[PDB]
Amino acid sequence: GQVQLVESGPGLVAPSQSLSITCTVSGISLSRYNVHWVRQSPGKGLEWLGMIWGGGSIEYNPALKSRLSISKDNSKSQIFLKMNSLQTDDSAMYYCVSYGYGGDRFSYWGQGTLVTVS
Amino acid sequence: DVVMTQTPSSLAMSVGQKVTMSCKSSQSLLNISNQKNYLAWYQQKPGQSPKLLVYFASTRESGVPDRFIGSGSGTDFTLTISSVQAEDQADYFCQQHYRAPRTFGGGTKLEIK
C-alpha cells in the first residue's frame, strides 16, 4: 500500500462558480515525481488537464488553459487544480496521477473525486 | 491534436485465448533522441480508477502479469494478452505522453465469457 494520492473536492457545485480540488500525496517526494490532473466522464471519456513536473514546470491543456490553474506545495505534499467558469459540462470524476522512479511502482493513480456541477 | 484512436471499440473473447487490441496516433510518438516510444496502456475495471499496465510501449508496470505484452512503435501500437483469464474483462485505454496535451485513446471494451 504505502503510497496514496487522495483527491478531495466539493462534490456538488453551482455553475460559473469556481472548482478547487486538492491531491494529497503520501509516501513519496514531490520533487522526484510528476503529477498530472485528468478527468473522466461517460460522455467525454478520459481527458488530460495538465501537470506540474517535479521541478516546478506546469503545462496545461490548450483548451482549458484559460480557465485552469495548477500549483503545488512540496512541504505539504499537495497539488492543486483550480478551474473557472464551470459549466454543467465539467462534471466528472477528477484524478491526480503521479509518475517517477524509485518506488515499488512508476505510477500511482489516485482514488478519484466526483465533481457534479449542478 | 495528437489523435489517439483505439481498436476495436469492443470485442468478445473467451477464457484462454490470445487477445489483440490496437492503438494508433496521428503522429509518431518516438523520441528520436532516446529511441523510446512514449505510449502507455491502462486497464480499468468497474468502479475503479484506471491502472497502468505498460509504458514506453513495452515496459510492464510492477505486478502486471507476463500475459500482457505491449508492442509496436512509431504510430501503431498493440496490447496483447497471451492467454486471457476471466478477471481480465475490463476497459483498456492507451495514452500518448509524447506531446502536451497527453491525449487518451477512446478505449476498447473487453468482454470475457
Short mmCIF file of C-alpha atoms in Angstrom, two decimals:
data_model
loop_
_atom_site.label_atom_id
_atom_site.label_comp_id
_atom_site.label_asym_id
_atom_site.label_seq_id
_atom_site.Cartn_x
_atom_site.Cartn_y
_atom_site.Cartn_z
CA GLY A 1 0.00 0.00 0.00
CA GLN A 2 2.21 2.78 1.48
CA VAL A 3 1.88 5.45 -1.25
CA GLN A 4 -1.52 7.12 -1.67
CA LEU A 5 -2.94 10.05 -3.72
CA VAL A 6 -6.21 11.20 -2.22
CA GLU A 7 -8.05 13.87 -4.06
CA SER A 8 -10.66 15.99 -2.28
CA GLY A 9 -13.17 18.30 -3.92
CA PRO A 10 -16.62 19.88 -3.36
CA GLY A 11 -18.83 17.10 -4.68
CA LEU A 12 -21.72 19.26 -5.92
CA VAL A 13 -21.09 22.81 -7.17
CA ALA A 14 -23.16 25.58 -8.76
CA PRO A 15 -22.13 26.59 -12.31
CA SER A 16 -19.87 29.57 -13.31
CA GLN A 17 -18.66 29.23 -9.70
CA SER A 18 -15.01 28.03 -9.40
CA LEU A 19 -13.82 24.47 -8.81
CA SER A 20 -10.96 23.62 -6.44
CA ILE A 21 -9.52 20.18 -5.88
CA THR A 22 -6.58 19.01 -3.80
CA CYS A 23 -4.47 15.96 -4.42
CA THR A 24 -2.91 14.86 -1.16
CA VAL A 25 0.18 12.66 -1.62
CA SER A 26 1.86 10.26 0.84
CA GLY A 27 4.99 8.11 0.86
CA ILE A 28 6.90 9.86 -1.92
CA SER A 29 8.74 13.12 -2.55
CA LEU A 30 7.02 15.63 -4.84
CA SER A 31 10.35 16.92 -6.14
CA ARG A 32 11.08 13.49 -7.57
CA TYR A 33 7.65 12.89 -9.12
CA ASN A 34 5.44 14.37 -11.83
CA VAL A 35 1.79 14.92 -11.06
CA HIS A 36 -0.92 15.13 -13.69
CA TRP A 37 -4.56 16.16 -13.48
CA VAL A 38 -7.04 14.14 -15.55
CA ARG A 39 -10.81 13.70 -15.53
CA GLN A 40 -13.20 11.08 -16.72
CA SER A 41 -16.85 11.00 -17.63
CA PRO A 42 -19.06 8.63 -19.61
CA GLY A 43 -19.75 11.33 -22.23
CA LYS A 44 -16.35 12.95 -22.60
CA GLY A 45 -14.17 9.85 -21.75
CA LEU A 46 -10.66 10.44 -20.34
CA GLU A 47 -9.22 13.93 -20.69
CA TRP A 48 -5.76 15.18 -19.74
CA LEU A 49 -5.96 18.53 -17.89
CA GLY A 50 -2.42 19.48 -17.09
CA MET A 51 0.58 18.55 -14.98
CA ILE A 52 3.26 20.05 -12.79
CA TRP A 53 6.75 18.48 -13.13
CA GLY A 54 8.88 17.56 -10.11
CA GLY A 55 10.82 20.73 -10.74
CA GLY A 56 8.10 23.42 -10.96
CA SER A 57 7.11 23.48 -14.66
CA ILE A 58 3.39 23.44 -15.37
CA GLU A 59 1.68 22.51 -18.57
CA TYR A 60 -1.99 22.82 -19.40
CA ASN A 61 -4.36 21.53 -21.93
CA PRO A 62 -4.56 24.27 -24.63
CA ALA A 63 -8.39 24.34 -24.41
CA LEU A 64 -9.00 24.71 -20.68
CA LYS A 65 -5.69 26.58 -20.19
CA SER A 66 -7.58 29.86 -19.80
CA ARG A 67 -9.84 28.54 -17.02
CA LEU A 68 -7.08 26.43 -15.48
CA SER A 69 -4.52 26.81 -12.75
CA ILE A 70 -2.21 24.08 -11.34
CA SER A 71 0.22 24.51 -8.44
CA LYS A 72 1.80 22.64 -5.52
CA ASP A 73 3.33 22.63 -2.06
CA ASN A 74 6.23 20.16 -1.72
CA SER A 75 6.28 20.71 2.02
CA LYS A 76 2.63 19.53 2.44
CA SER A 77 2.87 17.05 -0.43
CA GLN A 78 -0.16 18.58 -2.18
CA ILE A 79 -1.13 19.52 -5.71
CA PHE A 80 -3.89 21.94 -6.68
CA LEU A 81 -6.41 22.27 -9.51
CA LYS A 82 -8.48 25.49 -9.83
CA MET A 83 -10.89 25.53 -12.80
CA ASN A 84 -13.11 28.55 -13.53
CA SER A 85 -16.29 29.27 -15.47
CA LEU A 86 -17.77 25.97 -14.58
CA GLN A 87 -20.38 24.67 -16.98
CA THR A 88 -22.56 21.62 -16.38
CA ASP A 89 -20.16 20.10 -18.88
CA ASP A 90 -17.29 19.94 -16.44
CA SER A 91 -18.97 17.31 -14.25
CA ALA A 92 -16.56 14.38 -13.98
CA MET A 93 -14.54 12.07 -11.83
CA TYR A 94 -11.31 14.03 -11.30
CA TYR A 95 -7.94 12.38 -10.62
CA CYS A 96 -4.33 13.24 -9.90
CA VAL A 97 -1.75 10.76 -11.17
CA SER A 98 1.96 10.69 -10.44
CA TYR A 99 4.92 9.32 -12.32
CA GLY A 100 8.52 8.85 -11.21
CA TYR A 101 11.06 6.16 -10.29
CA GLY A 102 12.31 4.77 -7.03
CA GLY A 103 9.07 3.39 -5.64
CA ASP A 104 7.51 -0.06 -5.88
CA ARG A 105 5.73 1.39 -8.93
CA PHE A 106 6.44 4.02 -11.59
CA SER A 107 2.85 5.23 -11.36
CA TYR A 108 0.29 5.93 -8.74
CA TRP A 109 -3.25 6.70 -9.86
CA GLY A 110 -5.39 8.40 -7.18
CA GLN A 111 -8.90 7.43 -5.93
CA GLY A 112 -10.83 9.95 -7.95
CA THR A 113 -13.23 12.59 -6.81
CA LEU A 114 -16.67 13.19 -8.17
CA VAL A 115 -17.49 16.76 -9.15
CA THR A 116 -21.12 17.24 -10.02
CA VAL A 117 -21.60 20.74 -11.36
CA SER A 118 -25.35 21.15 -10.92
CA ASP B 1 -4.14 17.45 -31.88
CA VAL B 2 -2.20 14.18 -31.49
CA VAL B 3 -5.26 11.98 -32.12
CA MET B 4 -5.29 8.67 -30.31
CA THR B 5 -7.50 6.02 -31.90
CA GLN B 6 -8.06 2.57 -30.32
CA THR B 7 -9.50 -0.55 -31.97
CA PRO B 8 -11.76 -2.33 -31.71
CA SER B 9 -14.20 -0.28 -29.61
CA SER B 10 -15.32 -3.62 -28.18
CA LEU B 11 -14.81 -7.36 -28.57
CA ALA B 12 -15.94 -10.58 -27.00
CA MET B 13 -13.30 -13.16 -26.26
CA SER B 14 -13.29 -16.33 -24.28
CA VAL B 15 -11.04 -17.55 -21.46
CA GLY B 16 -7.62 -18.80 -22.55
CA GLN B 17 -7.49 -17.01 -25.94
CA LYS B 18 -4.93 -14.51 -27.24
CA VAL B 19 -6.44 -11.05 -27.22
CA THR B 20 -5.26 -8.34 -29.53
CA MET B 21 -6.14 -4.71 -29.32
CA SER B 22 -4.66 -1.87 -31.30
CA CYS B 23 -3.92 1.82 -30.57
CA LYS B 24 -2.79 4.40 -33.22
CA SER B 25 -1.56 8.00 -33.09
CA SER B 26 -1.92 10.66 -35.77
CA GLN B 27 1.79 11.47 -35.28
CA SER B 28 4.88 9.46 -34.36
CA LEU B 29 5.39 9.12 -30.60
CA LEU B 30 9.04 8.08 -30.89
CA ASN B 31 11.57 10.41 -29.36
CA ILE B 32 14.44 10.49 -31.82
CA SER B 33 16.90 11.10 -29.01
CA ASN B 34 16.40 8.22 -26.59
CA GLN B 35 14.60 5.96 -29.09
CA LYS B 36 11.76 5.35 -26.60
CA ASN B 37 8.12 5.35 -27.79
CA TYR B 38 6.07 7.49 -25.37
CA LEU B 39 2.87 5.42 -25.12
CA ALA B 40 1.23 3.83 -22.06
CA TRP B 41 -1.56 1.27 -21.63
CA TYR B 42 -4.17 1.14 -18.86
CA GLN B 43 -6.83 -1.24 -17.53
CA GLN B 44 -9.96 -0.02 -15.81
CA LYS B 45 -12.31 -2.39 -14.01
CA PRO B 46 -15.84 -1.47 -12.76
CA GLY B 47 -15.92 1.47 -10.35
CA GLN B 48 -12.12 1.50 -10.00
CA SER B 49 -9.63 4.02 -11.32
CA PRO B 50 -7.55 3.09 -14.33
CA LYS B 51 -4.27 1.28 -13.55
CA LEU B 52 -1.09 1.35 -15.67
CA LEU B 53 -0.16 -1.90 -17.40
CA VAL B 54 2.62 -0.89 -19.80
CA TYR B 55 4.78 2.21 -20.56
CA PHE B 56 7.37 3.17 -23.19
CA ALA B 57 5.29 0.79 -25.32
CA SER B 58 6.58 -2.44 -23.80
CA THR B 59 7.78 -1.85 -20.24
CA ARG B 60 5.33 -3.63 -17.90
CA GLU B 61 4.50 -1.94 -14.64
CA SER B 62 5.10 -3.75 -11.34
CA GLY B 63 2.69 -6.55 -10.54
CA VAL B 64 1.46 -6.59 -14.10
CA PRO B 65 1.47 -10.25 -15.20
CA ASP B 66 3.67 -11.64 -18.03
CA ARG B 67 0.50 -12.34 -20.10
CA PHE B 68 0.00 -8.64 -21.01
CA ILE B 69 2.52 -7.56 -23.69
CA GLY B 70 2.86 -4.20 -25.31
CA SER B 71 4.46 -3.96 -28.73
CA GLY B 72 4.76 -1.69 -31.74
CA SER B 73 6.36 1.69 -32.46
CA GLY B 74 6.03 5.00 -34.31
CA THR B 75 2.28 5.40 -34.68
CA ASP B 76 0.87 1.88 -34.40
CA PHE B 77 0.90 0.04 -31.09
CA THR B 78 -0.56 -3.12 -29.65
CA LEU B 79 -1.60 -4.63 -26.37
CA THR B 80 -1.67 -8.38 -26.48
CA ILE B 81 -2.99 -10.71 -23.80
CA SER B 82 -1.29 -14.07 -24.44
CA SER B 83 -3.94 -16.14 -22.63
CA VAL B 84 -6.99 -14.33 -21.22
CA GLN B 85 -8.39 -15.03 -17.84
CA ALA B 86 -11.89 -14.05 -16.74
CA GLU B 87 -10.61 -11.41 -14.33
CA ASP B 88 -9.32 -9.58 -17.41
CA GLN B 89 -12.70 -8.36 -18.57
CA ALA B 90 -12.21 -4.58 -18.46
CA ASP B 91 -11.72 -1.35 -20.40
CA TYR B 92 -8.28 -0.75 -21.87
CA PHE B 93 -7.09 2.69 -22.90
CA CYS B 94 -3.82 3.99 -24.28
CA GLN B 95 -2.43 7.46 -23.68
CA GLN B 96 0.35 9.20 -25.57
CA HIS B 97 2.89 11.02 -23.41
CA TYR B 98 4.94 12.48 -26.24
CA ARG B 99 3.41 15.91 -26.58
CA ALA B 100 1.14 18.00 -24.41
CA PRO B 101 -1.87 17.58 -24.33
CA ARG B 102 -1.28 13.94 -23.43
CA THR B 103 -4.47 12.62 -25.03
CA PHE B 104 -6.14 9.24 -24.40
CA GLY B 105 -7.48 6.70 -26.83
CA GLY B 106 -11.23 6.09 -26.83
CA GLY B 107 -10.87 2.74 -25.14
CA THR B 108 -11.58 -0.84 -26.11
CA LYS B 109 -14.17 -2.71 -24.06
CA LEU B 110 -13.06 -6.29 -23.46
CA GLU B 111 -15.79 -8.75 -22.57
CA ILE B 112 -14.68 -12.16 -21.32
CA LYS B 113 -17.17 -15.05 -21.47
#
